[PDB]
Amino acid sequence: HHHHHHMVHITLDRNTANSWLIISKDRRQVRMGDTHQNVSDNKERFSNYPMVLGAQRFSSGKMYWEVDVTQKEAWDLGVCRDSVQRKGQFSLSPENGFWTIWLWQDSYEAGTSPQTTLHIQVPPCQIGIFVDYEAGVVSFYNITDHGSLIYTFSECVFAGPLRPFFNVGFNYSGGNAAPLKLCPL
Numbered sequence: 460h461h462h463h464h465h466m467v468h469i470t471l472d473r474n475t476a477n478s479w480l481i482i483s484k485d486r487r488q489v490r491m492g493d494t495h496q497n498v499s500d501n502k503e504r505f506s507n508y509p510m511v512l513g514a515q516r517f518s519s520g521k522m523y524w525e526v527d528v529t530q531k532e533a534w535d536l537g538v539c540r541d542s543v544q545r546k547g548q549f550s551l552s553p554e555n556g557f558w559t560i561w562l563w564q565d566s567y568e569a570g571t572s573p574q575t576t577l578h579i580q581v582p583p584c585q586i587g588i589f590v591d592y593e594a595g596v597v598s599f600y601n602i603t604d605h606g607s608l609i610y611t612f613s614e615c616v617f618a619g620p621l622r623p624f625f626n627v628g629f630n631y632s633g634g635n636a637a638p639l640k641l642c643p644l
């Protein structure tokens with residue numbers, strides 16, 4: 460791909476974070492803490508999952524960013540509507556306002572309903588996310604494998620402003636403590 464030139468500087472929005480998340484001072488890294496992080500509750504926080512949004516809102520244009528997933532066992536990445544449900548249980552689907560891929564139990568899947576199997580020969584350590592608002596496209600790239608395509612959602616119905624979306628995953632195993640990191644441009 461030649462999408463790198465639409466690079467945007469993403470930072471994480473503390474106010475949207477699940478109360479167990481720890482966001483770095485520079486707002487570029489997030490990990491699961493071992494306990495509640497001593498913040499007050501608010502209507503923006505994701506309550507059932509270790510999720511957080513980017514601060515940036517997009518309603519037009521082409522945008523690209525990269526995320527480091529090194530040594531993680533489980534995570535979700537992509538974009539979502541600003542108006543997604545924050546409280547209780549829900550599935551990641553375009554019908555619910557999410558355009559995502561994930562790693563879970565040694566397999567990669569796209570968050571369609573039902574989910575779609577991904578075919579990745581080189582497990583990625585960094586993922587590139589490309590959004591073309593006008594075209595209705597969200598694409599995922601394997602930076603570890605020379606930028607090879609992972610998945611494209613097309614004919615997307617964004618239906619409002621979009622925010623970068625992250626899930627660091629639980630750490631029931633003791634093997635998923637590593638952070639998600641936004642990579643430099």
Ligand SMILES: CCOc1ccccc1N1CCNCC1
Pocket residue numbers: 477479506507508509
């Ligand atoms: C591990 C302690 O639990 C959480 C920690 C952070 C977010 C959600 C949960 N729950 C929500 C209720 N179901 C169990 C996990």
